[PDB]
Amino acid sequence: LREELQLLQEQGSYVGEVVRAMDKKKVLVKVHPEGKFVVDVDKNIDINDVTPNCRVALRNDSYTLHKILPNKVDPLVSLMMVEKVPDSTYEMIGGLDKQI
Amino acid sequence: MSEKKQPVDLRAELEKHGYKMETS
Amino acid sequence: FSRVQIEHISSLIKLSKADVERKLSQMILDKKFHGILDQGEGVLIIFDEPPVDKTYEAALETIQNMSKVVDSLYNKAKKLT
Amino acid sequence: PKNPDLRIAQLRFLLSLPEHRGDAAVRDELMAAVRDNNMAPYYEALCKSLDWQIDVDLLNKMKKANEDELKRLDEELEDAEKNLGESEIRDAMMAKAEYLCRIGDKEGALTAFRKTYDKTVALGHRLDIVFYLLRIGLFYMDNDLITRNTEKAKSLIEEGGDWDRRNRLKVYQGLYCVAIRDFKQAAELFLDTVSTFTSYELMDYKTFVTYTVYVSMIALERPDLREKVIKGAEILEVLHSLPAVRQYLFSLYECRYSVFFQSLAVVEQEMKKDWLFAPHYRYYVREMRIHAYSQLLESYRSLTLGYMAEAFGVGVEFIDQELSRFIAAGRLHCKIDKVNEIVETNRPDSKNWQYQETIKKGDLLLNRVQKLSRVINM
Amino acid sequence: EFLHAQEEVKRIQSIPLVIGQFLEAVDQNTAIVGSTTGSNYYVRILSTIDRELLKPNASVALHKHSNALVDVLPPEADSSIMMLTSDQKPDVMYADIGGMDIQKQEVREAVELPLTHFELYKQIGIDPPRGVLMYGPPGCGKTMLAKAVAHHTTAAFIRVVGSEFVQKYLGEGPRMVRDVFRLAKENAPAIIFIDEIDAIATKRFDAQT
Amino acid sequence: PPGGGEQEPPPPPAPQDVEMKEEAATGGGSTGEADGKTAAAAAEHSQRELDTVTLEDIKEHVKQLEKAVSGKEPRFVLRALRMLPSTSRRLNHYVLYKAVQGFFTSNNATRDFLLPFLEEPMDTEADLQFRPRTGKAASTPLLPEVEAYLQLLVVIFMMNSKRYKEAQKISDDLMQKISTQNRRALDLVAAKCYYYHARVYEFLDKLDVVRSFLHARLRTATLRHDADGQATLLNLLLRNYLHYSLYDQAEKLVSKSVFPEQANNNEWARYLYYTGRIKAIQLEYSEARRTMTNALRKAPQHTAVGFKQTVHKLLIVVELLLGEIPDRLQFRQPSLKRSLMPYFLLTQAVRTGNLAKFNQVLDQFGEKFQADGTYTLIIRLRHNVIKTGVRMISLSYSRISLADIAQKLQLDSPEDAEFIVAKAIRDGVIEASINHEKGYVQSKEMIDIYSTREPQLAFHQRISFCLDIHNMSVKAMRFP
Amino acid sequence: YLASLIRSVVALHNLINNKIANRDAEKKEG
Amino acid sequence: DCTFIRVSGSELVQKFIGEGARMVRELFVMAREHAPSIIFMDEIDSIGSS
Amino acid sequence: EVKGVCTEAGMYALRERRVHVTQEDFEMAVAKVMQKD
């Protein structure tokens, strides 16, 4: 606890999003409150394990990527969609037997 | 168990309280 | 004043002693008035020892702790049969 | 559809406990037997009460004609299910078979209760079912099935809301709390008083008034007692119609002890002849002793028994043996002195009893853990 | 020595501790949080409390140096306004104006019973709507009609517009509105009226907005 | 005839299976358990043997008779044989005799054939490793057979099992080494047939010759194997020594020790009922009420049947001599009720302070008093009536004349009226003060004190010594 | 008095829960 | 179970995908990520928008 | 229209507090939601 309480100040920690990966093993990731960075492997999770537009934990010291997390795009879109109307089904609708 | 030991073998009152008045 | 005679406290309230004794004792019946009277010498004395709090804590624990061991009767008598 | 059979069950109590009624109890039993066409009930009544003479073909042709009324319904269920509707089929066979089970025992009752349990979408019919378990549980004095139907009904009623039938359930649970010994919940749940009005499931309203006014004199405080009866606007008139209990209410507040055992004699005489009140009167009486004597001693710490004997008629040597023998039984323990003319109360018991619950409860507590401690392992 | 270590971890750390804007717990022993300066983080949480009080949405006090995940607020005293405005005044009697009776017919059935009964909406089979509108001013009514029910129904009343909670920093919105929800439902029964919500409905593009 | 003739085949297969595999799986499994681990003991098949023996004690036992596979006696009692690799061939010979019994009549009747059978293990020479297996293979037919009570020619066969157990007793005096882990199971099994010693000897008269023999066995187990041995043998001592005089009250004084550890389970509770009647003969009522209550409260789960109801019967006897008892009619079972029916009105007469109510109970129920065995305290309880009677009236009455109380105190003359209350203060009853002229007894009370010191200060050692024992248990139960 | 109360609470919780997890670990493993 | 899509969409579902364009291509790219998909015109069923 | 049938009918039954409704209250909202046009 104290060691991680010693580790985590001199650096901090953040969460990134990979927009691309490099042949040099680096990765294109944004520091989201600020301008973007481009940082390297990160030898546990390889390049092929993750694809661009995915949530990663931006490391705070070498400014590398710590861990892997899921990211959402359509759940914003589909929520804006599902905002408008629900669905129900056949059983919950009637009179359309002609047009169905 | 079945082991060991075991296998070997003023009223209420209604009438009297009402009578105490007319007694004396 | 805790200890007081009944006749001169009835002079302060301006009432007969018969319904002063019965109303004051009725106030003891209501428990709002802490004390008791004395008919023999015509005295009225006030005394109180309010806190029960420790007995409330004790009883609340142990009376339920009965059901506690009743709850342990289920587990510890289940291993037997 | 209750009071006719409810009186039959009341007639069972009139036959069972007292052995001195051999005429009126069997008479009106037959008067209620010739109607509603009961079969299994008069069998239990035949063993308890007189065997006649002869019934035989009389009630056998009445059970044969009622079988025709039973077979017209039981052969209409396959003719009714030929068509299709909502409850217009099974609601006829659930209620009338319970009337056909009213002919006897629990069979058609319990089998229709779980039958219609999967059909009715309204709580009113489900609570009517609950009413059927409550009447059939009242006749056989079985408290097992009266808890389950109400526990399942209240969840649907309290989901929820009601006015009339909620007060009806308050009378039910009040009759169950008074069936066993519960002093506080009977009067607390009967606080609705006249808002229940009169119903076939509530039988005689005057008897219900006597039920709540008899049970409100025990666990209810004296200021709360007069707050219920005197301050209550609606309950005051219905308790005023019967001077028997009203005299006991206002004389209990009047503190006069010369009318108490006579008014309690009329109250106890009504307590003896009513069902389910037989086990509970033995404690109810001595409780009224310590109830009336609690306000007798609390007047003065040191009381002169000469002042007590002033108006008693007569309390000189009577309160000596009376109160004493009640002290020896554990009711209103006090230390009273004579020829010094000092009645000393107290007894507060603010020292022993204050700390007694620790060791007392701890005795059986630590005992019950001593069992489980020394049993295992070996 | 382990009791001494318990004195260490309970002394750790601060006093003073910066509280921050929490979003979600990603997985075991760690989570993501924005500070009150609005930046998402990744921190291994305090060991002895993993979950129960952390919750999906709260405000967790972050370590002075590290911004470590430690503990959240009670919650909470919250932040802005808050509510009252009746016992601390003002209040105006609605009974003077009776011309709005048919306009109150909605507010009649749409306020009192919706708050005082959530159970009746299970019984009827219809879900209570959150929809209420006002429109037309002048004639105004409106805001003063919202002062009315503050007489009887005792709940929160928040004076809020679209343009008063505009800030120089973007993250203060959920530092208000996300707190507005967690301060409402936690202090519930509570009510909130946003006066003139139309300020935030404008369609716009430029990144300054 | 065809129904009763065709209903004979169905029953035997159930004993043919469970009664075959009960001592085969438990006894044969205890063989591997006795080869190693052997910690402690444990030897969990010893307690499993207790479950099988107590299972047979209800249904079906074995013998009878029953005319179903009486060849189970020579099965396990022969063919050790002999060393372990040769025993494996005999482990197949049990299956060989299963086929032989599955072909021919299978020797469904033994009877007088027990004489060569029971002596066949001595013809093998020898098992030789496990004496409990030899003693159990011979006793398991015979011990449930004692429940037949035929009392003809098979009683001496039970005595032959007692002689085989005496060979188990001599081997209980020798090996070891060093470290017998099978002698705890020998303590278990022998305690059983030591109670079968009691039953078989009680068929005619007292066992007194076996009282010196029990003292020979009980003392030769000292101090080595007394553990779980001395407890059961002390109950074997105490039970029938409670039936036959004398001196056991002072004998158990010098016998203790305690004797720790208490084993097994209810054994110490029933011992505290046996010695509970003992310590109740000294009449100290705090130790007697605590040993009688701890006797019943410490005994699960029964059934069967009525002796666990008997400890509850005699339990409140010392509570009757205390002067205050609750009405126990709410504790009546369907069995214990019909057994204590006179004792009901007895304790009801103890609650009441009436003399004629208690004396009429004595005259009417004296026959049941002969059945229980408790007598001497019934006449002296009249002194409990005079002390509870004066405790009643004194605290009851304001000021009572010695002539008016003389009805319930039956004498209460102007002289002894002083001593009734005064010598009650010597017993700590009532504080009533009496100025004697006519006279009159004026009872007051002022006490505010106590309810404090001993309860809480003892609760300290109570809880702490408890949790210390619970430490000694949990800390030591983590071997797995 | 409070001391005896903590004694009953500490003994109740610890002893019951420990014997539970004890007898369970022994009967399940053995 | 085919996914469902709508038309504009205000105000802020637009630049939320991309930056600026004809803006229908990115929506056409959305359906490449999930197929089968359902797209809808919400609403423009009325006589008032004419 | 089908949405508003029993809603406003329930709204008065809501206001009435009844558990299950009668067609009259449904007939009331039959007018109510159709009063506007």
Coordinates of C-alpha atoms in Angstrom, one line a residue, chain D:
Chain D
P1 CA -72.9 -17.0 4.3
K2 CA -71.0 -17.0 7.6
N3 CA -73.2 -16.0 10.6
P4 CA -75.5 -19.0 10.1
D5 CA -72.5 -21.4 10.4
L6 CA -70.7 -19.0 12.8
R7 CA -73.6 -19.6 15.2
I8 CA -73.2 -23.3 14.7
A9 CA -69.6 -23.1 15.8
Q10 CA -70.7 -20.9 18.7
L11 CA -73.2 -23.6 19.5
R12 CA -70.3 -26.1 19.5
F13 CA -68.7 -24.0 22.2
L14 CA -72.1 -23.9 24.0
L15 CA -72.3 -27.7 23.9
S16 CA -68.7 -28.5 24.6
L17 CA -67.5 -26.7 27.8
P18 CA -70.7 -26.4 29.9
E19 CA -72.3 -29.6 30.8
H20 CA -75.5 -28.0 32.3
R21 CA -77.2 -27.1 29.0
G22 CA -79.1 -30.0 27.6
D23 CA -82.0 -28.3 25.8
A24 CA -81.5 -25.0 24.1
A25 CA -78.1 -25.8 22.7
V26 CA -79.3 -28.9 20.9
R27 CA -82.6 -27.3 19.9
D28 CA -81.1 -24.4 17.9
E29 CA -78.4 -26.8 16.6
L30 CA -81.2 -28.7 14.9
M31 CA -82.8 -25.4 13.9
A32 CA -79.5 -24.5 12.2
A33 CA -79.0 -28.1 11.0
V34 CA -82.3 -28.2 8.9
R35 CA -80.9 -25.2 7.0
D36 CA -77.7 -24.9 4.9
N37 CA -77.9 -28.7 4.6
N38 CA -74.8 -29.5 6.6
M39 CA -73.4 -33.1 6.5
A40 CA -69.9 -33.4 8.0
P41 CA -70.6 -30.8 10.7
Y42 CA -73.5 -32.7 12.2
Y43 CA -71.4 -35.8 12.3
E44 CA -69.0 -34.3 14.8
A45 CA -72.1 -32.8 16.5
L46 CA -73.7 -36.2 16.5
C47 CA -70.8 -37.7 18.5
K48 CA -70.6 -34.8 20.9
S49 CA -74.3 -34.1 21.3
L50 CA -77.2 -36.5 21.3
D51 CA -77.3 -39.4 18.8
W52 CA -81.1 -39.2 18.5
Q53 CA -83.3 -41.6 17.6
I54 CA -83.2 -41.2 13.8
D55 CA -81.6 -39.0 11.2
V56 CA -80.7 -41.4 8.4
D57 CA -82.9 -41.0 5.3
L58 CA -83.8 -37.4 6.3
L59 CA -80.3 -35.9 5.9
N60 CA -79.4 -38.7 3.4
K61 CA -82.1 -37.5 1.0
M62 CA -81.1 -34.0 1.8
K63 CA -77.5 -34.9 0.9
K64 CA -79.0 -36.7 -2.1
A65 CA -80.9 -33.7 -3.3
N66 CA -77.9 -31.5 -2.5
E67 CA -75.8 -34.0 -4.4
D68 CA -78.2 -33.3 -7.4
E69 CA -77.4 -29.6 -6.7
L70 CA -73.8 -30.8 -6.4
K71 CA -73.9 -32.9 -9.5
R72 CA -75.6 -30.2 -11.5
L73 CA -72.6 -27.9 -10.8
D74 CA -70.0 -30.7 -11.2
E75 CA -71.5 -31.8 -14.5
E76 CA -71.8 -28.2 -15.6
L77 CA -68.0 -27.6 -15.3
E78 CA -67.3 -29.8 -18.4
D79 CA -70.3 -28.1 -20.2
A80 CA -69.1 -24.7 -19.2
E81 CA -65.5 -25.3 -20.3
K82 CA -66.9 -26.3 -23.7
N83 CA -67.2 -22.5 -24.2
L84 CA -64.4 -20.0 -23.4
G85 CA -64.6 -16.9 -21.2
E86 CA -62.8 -15.0 -18.5
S87 CA -63.7 -16.3 -15.0
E88 CA -67.3 -16.7 -16.1
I89 CA -66.7 -20.5 -15.9
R90 CA -64.3 -21.1 -13.0
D91 CA -65.7 -18.4 -10.7
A92 CA -68.9 -20.3 -10.5
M93 CA -67.2 -23.6 -9.5
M94 CA -64.8 -22.0 -7.0
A95 CA -67.5 -20.2 -4.9
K96 CA -70.3 -22.8 -5.1
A97 CA -67.9 -25.7 -4.4
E98 CA -66.9 -23.8 -1.3
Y99 CA -70.6 -23.7 -0.6
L100 CA -70.6 -27.4 -1.4
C101 CA -67.6 -27.7 1.0
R102 CA -69.6 -25.7 3.5
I103 CA -71.6 -28.9 3.5
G104 CA -68.5 -30.5 5.1
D105 CA -64.9 -30.4 6.4
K106 CA -62.0 -28.8 4.6
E107 CA -61.9 -30.8 1.4
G108 CA -63.7 -28.7 -1.2
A109 CA -62.5 -25.6 0.6
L110 CA -58.7 -26.2 0.4
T111 CA -59.0 -27.7 -3.0
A112 CA -60.9 -24.7 -4.4
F113 CA -58.5 -22.2 -2.6
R114 CA -55.5 -23.5 -4.5
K115 CA -57.7 -24.1 -7.5
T116 CA -58.7 -20.5 -8.0
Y117 CA -55.3 -19.2 -6.7
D118 CA -54.0 -19.3 -10.3
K119 CA -57.0 -17.6 -11.9
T120 CA -58.4 -14.5 -10.1
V121 CA -56.7 -11.3 -11.2
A122 CA -58.3 -9.1 -8.5
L123 CA -57.5 -9.0 -4.8
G124 CA -61.1 -8.7 -3.8
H125 CA -61.9 -12.3 -4.8
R126 CA -58.5 -13.5 -3.3
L127 CA -59.5 -11.8 0.0
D128 CA -62.9 -13.5 -0.3
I129 CA -61.0 -16.7 -0.4
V130 CA -59.1 -15.5 2.7
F131 CA -62.5 -14.9 4.3
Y132 CA -63.3 -18.6 3.6
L133 CA -60.1 -19.8 5.3
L134 CA -60.8 -17.5 8.2
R135 CA -64.4 -18.8 8.8
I136 CA -63.4 -22.4 8.3
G137 CA -60.5 -21.7 10.7
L138 CA -62.8 -20.1 13.2
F139 CA -65.2 -23.1 13.2
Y140 CA -62.4 -25.6 13.8
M141 CA -60.3 -23.1 15.9
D142 CA -57.3 -23.9 13.7
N143 CA -54.8 -21.0 13.7
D144 CA -52.4 -22.7 11.2
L145 CA -54.2 -21.7 8.0
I146 CA -55.4 -18.3 9.1
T147 CA -51.9 -16.9 9.2
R148 CA -50.9 -18.0 5.6
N149 CA -53.9 -16.7 3.7
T150 CA -53.6 -13.3 5.5
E151 CA -49.8 -13.1 5.0
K152 CA -50.3 -13.6 1.2
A153 CA -53.3 -11.3 1.0
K154 CA -51.9 -8.3 2.9
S155 CA -49.0 -8.1 0.4
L156 CA -51.6 -7.7 -2.4
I157 CA -53.7 -5.4 -0.2
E158 CA -50.8 -3.2 1.0
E159 CA -49.2 -3.0 -2.5
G160 CA -51.7 -1.2 -2.3
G161 CA -54.6 0.4 -0.4
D162 CA -58.1 -0.3 0.9
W163 CA -60.6 1.2 3.3
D164 CA -63.4 -1.3 4.4
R165 CA -61.6 -4.6 3.9
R166 CA -58.5 -3.3 5.6
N167 CA -60.5 -2.6 8.7
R168 CA -62.0 -6.1 8.3
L169 CA -58.5 -7.7 8.4
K170 CA -57.8 -5.6 11.5
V171 CA -60.8 -7.3 13.2
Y172 CA -59.5 -10.7 12.0
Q173 CA -56.0 -10.3 13.3
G174 CA -57.6 -8.8 16.4
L175 CA -59.7 -11.9 16.9
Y176 CA -56.6 -14.1 16.4
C177 CA -54.5 -12.0 18.8
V178 CA -57.3 -12.4 21.3
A179 CA -57.7 -16.1 20.5
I180 CA -54.2 -16.6 22.0
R181 CA -53.0 -14.2 24.7
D182 CA -52.2 -10.8 23.3
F183 CA -53.4 -7.8 25.3
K184 CA -52.0 -4.9 23.4
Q185 CA -52.4 -5.9 19.8
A186 CA -56.1 -6.7 20.3
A187 CA -57.1 -3.2 21.5
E188 CA -54.5 -1.4 19.3
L189 CA -55.9 -3.1 16.1
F190 CA -59.5 -2.5 17.3
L191 CA -58.8 1.2 17.6
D192 CA -60.9 1.6 14.4
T193 CA -64.0 0.9 16.5
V194 CA -67.2 2.0 14.7
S195 CA -65.5 2.5 11.3
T196 CA -66.0 -1.3 10.7
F197 CA -69.8 -0.8 11.0
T198 CA -71.6 -4.2 10.8
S199 CA -70.9 -7.1 8.5
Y200 CA -71.7 -10.8 8.1
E201 CA -68.0 -11.7 8.6
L202 CA -67.9 -9.4 11.7
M203 CA -71.1 -11.1 13.1
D204 CA -72.9 -9.1 15.8
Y205 CA -71.5 -5.6 16.0
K206 CA -72.4 -5.3 19.7
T207 CA -70.3 -8.5 20.4
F208 CA -67.4 -6.8 18.6
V209 CA -67.9 -3.7 20.8
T210 CA -67.7 -6.0 23.9
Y211 CA -64.6 -7.7 22.5
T212 CA -62.6 -4.4 22.1
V213 CA -63.9 -2.8 25.3
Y214 CA -63.1 -6.0 27.4
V215 CA -59.6 -6.2 26.1
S216 CA -58.8 -2.4 26.3
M217 CA -58.9 -2.5 30.2
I218 CA -55.7 -4.7 30.6
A219 CA -52.6 -3.5 28.7
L220 CA -53.9 0.1 28.2
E221 CA -52.8 2.7 30.6
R222 CA -55.4 4.5 32.8
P223 CA -55.0 7.9 31.1
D224 CA -55.0 6.0 27.8
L225 CA -58.0 4.1 28.9
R226 CA -60.1 7.2 29.5
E227 CA -58.6 8.7 26.4
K228 CA -60.0 5.7 24.4
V229 CA -63.5 5.5 25.9
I230 CA -64.3 9.0 27.1
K231 CA -62.4 11.1 24.5
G232 CA -63.4 8.7 21.7
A233 CA -66.4 10.3 20.0
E234 CA -67.7 7.3 18.0
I235 CA -66.9 4.5 20.5
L236 CA -68.6 6.2 23.4
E237 CA -72.2 5.7 22.3
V238 CA -71.8 2.0 21.4
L239 CA -70.2 1.4 24.8
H240 CA -72.9 3.5 26.4
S241 CA -75.7 1.2 25.1
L242 CA -74.5 -1.5 27.4
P243 CA -74.3 -0.2 31.0
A244 CA -72.5 -3.4 32.2
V245 CA -69.1 -2.5 30.7
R246 CA -69.7 1.2 30.8
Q247 CA -70.2 1.0 34.6
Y248 CA -66.9 -0.9 34.8
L249 CA -65.1 1.8 32.8
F250 CA -66.3 4.8 34.7
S251 CA -66.1 3.2 38.1
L252 CA -62.6 2.0 37.3
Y253 CA -61.7 5.7 36.8
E254 CA -63.9 6.6 39.7
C255 CA -61.7 4.3 41.8
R256 CA -64.6 3.0 43.9
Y257 CA -63.8 -0.6 45.0
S258 CA -67.3 -1.4 46.3
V259 CA -68.8 -2.0 42.9
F260 CA -65.7 -3.6 41.3
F261 CA -66.2 -7.3 41.9
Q262 CA -70.0 -7.0 41.1
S263 CA -69.3 -5.3 37.8
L264 CA -66.4 -7.7 37.3
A265 CA -68.9 -10.5 38.0
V266 CA -71.1 -9.4 35.1
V267 CA -68.0 -8.9 32.9
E268 CA -66.6 -12.3 33.9
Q269 CA -70.0 -14.0 33.4
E270 CA -69.9 -12.6 29.9
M271 CA -66.3 -13.8 29.7
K272 CA -67.2 -17.4 30.6
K273 CA -70.0 -17.9 28.0
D274 CA -67.9 -16.5 25.0
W275 CA -65.6 -18.7 23.0
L276 CA -61.8 -18.5 23.0
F277 CA -62.0 -16.5 26.2
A278 CA -61.8 -19.6 28.5
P279 CA -58.0 -19.9 28.8
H280 CA -57.4 -16.1 29.2
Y281 CA -59.7 -15.2 32.0
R282 CA -57.6 -16.7 34.8
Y283 CA -54.9 -14.1 34.3
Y284 CA -57.4 -11.5 33.2
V285 CA -59.0 -11.4 36.7
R286 CA -55.9 -11.2 38.9
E287 CA -54.7 -8.7 36.4
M288 CA -57.7 -6.5 37.1
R289 CA -56.8 -6.9 40.8
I290 CA -53.3 -5.6 40.3
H291 CA -54.8 -3.0 37.9
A292 CA -57.2 -1.5 40.4
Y293 CA -54.7 -1.9 43.3
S294 CA -51.9 -0.2 41.4
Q295 CA -53.8 3.1 41.8
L296 CA -54.8 2.1 45.3
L297 CA -51.3 2.1 46.7
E298 CA -49.8 4.8 44.5
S299 CA -51.8 7.5 46.3
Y300 CA -49.3 7.9 49.2
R301 CA -46.0 6.3 50.1
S302 CA -47.0 5.7 53.7
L303 CA -50.7 5.2 53.8
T304 CA -52.9 4.9 56.9
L305 CA -55.3 1.9 56.6
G306 CA -57.7 3.7 58.8
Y307 CA -58.2 6.3 56.0
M308 CA -58.6 3.3 53.6
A309 CA -61.3 1.9 55.8
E310 CA -63.2 5.2 55.9
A311 CA -65.5 4.4 53.0
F312 CA -65.0 0.7 52.0
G313 CA -67.9 -1.2 53.5
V314 CA -66.0 -2.9 54.9
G315 CA -62.2 -2.7 54.5
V316 CA -60.9 -2.8 58.1
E317 CA -59.8 -6.5 58.2
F318 CA -60.8 -7.3 54.6
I319 CA -58.0 -5.5 52.8
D320 CA -55.6 -7.2 55.1
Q321 CA -56.3 -10.8 54.0
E322 CA -57.4 -9.7 50.5
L323 CA -54.3 -7.7 49.4
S324 CA -52.0 -10.0 51.3
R325 CA -53.1 -13.2 49.6
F326 CA -52.7 -11.2 46.3
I327 CA -49.2 -10.2 47.4
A328 CA -48.4 -13.9 48.1
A329 CA -49.4 -14.7 44.5
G330 CA -47.0 -12.1 43.1
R331 CA -49.5 -9.4 42.3
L332 CA -48.5 -6.0 43.6
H333 CA -45.8 -6.9 46.0
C334 CA -45.5 -4.4 48.9
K335 CA -44.6 -4.1 52.6
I336 CA -47.5 -3.0 54.7
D337 CA -47.5 -2.5 58.5
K338 CA -50.4 -2.7 61.0
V339 CA -50.8 -1.3 64.6
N340 CA -48.3 1.2 63.3
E341 CA -51.0 2.0 60.6
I342 CA -48.5 2.3 57.8
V343 CA -49.0 1.0 54.2
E344 CA -45.6 1.5 52.6
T345 CA -45.3 1.5 48.8
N346 CA -42.7 1.4 47.0
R347 CA -41.7 -1.4 46.2
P348 CA -39.7 0.2 43.4
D349 CA -37.1 -2.6 42.9
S350 CA -34.8 -0.1 41.3
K351 CA -31.6 -1.9 42.4
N352 CA -31.9 -5.7 42.1
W353 CA -34.2 -5.8 39.1
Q354 CA -32.2 -3.0 37.4
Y355 CA -29.0 -5.1 37.2
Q356 CA -30.8 -8.5 37.4
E357 CA -31.4 -8.9 33.7
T358 CA -27.7 -9.2 33.1
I359 CA -27.1 -12.2 35.3
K360 CA -30.7 -13.6 34.7
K361 CA -30.5 -13.6 30.9
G362 CA -26.8 -14.4 31.1
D363 CA -27.6 -17.5 33.1
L364 CA -29.5 -19.2 30.4
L365 CA -27.5 -17.4 27.7
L366 CA -24.1 -18.7 28.9
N367 CA -25.8 -22.0 29.7
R368 CA -27.0 -22.4 26.1
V369 CA -23.5 -21.6 24.8
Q370 CA -22.0 -24.0 27.4
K371 CA -24.1 -26.8 25.9
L372 CA -22.8 -26.1 22.3
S373 CA -19.3 -25.5 23.7
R374 CA -18.9 -28.8 25.6
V375 CA -20.8 -31.0 23.1
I376 CA -18.3 -30.4 20.3
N377 CA -15.8 -31.7 19.8
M378 CA -16.6 -34.8 22.0

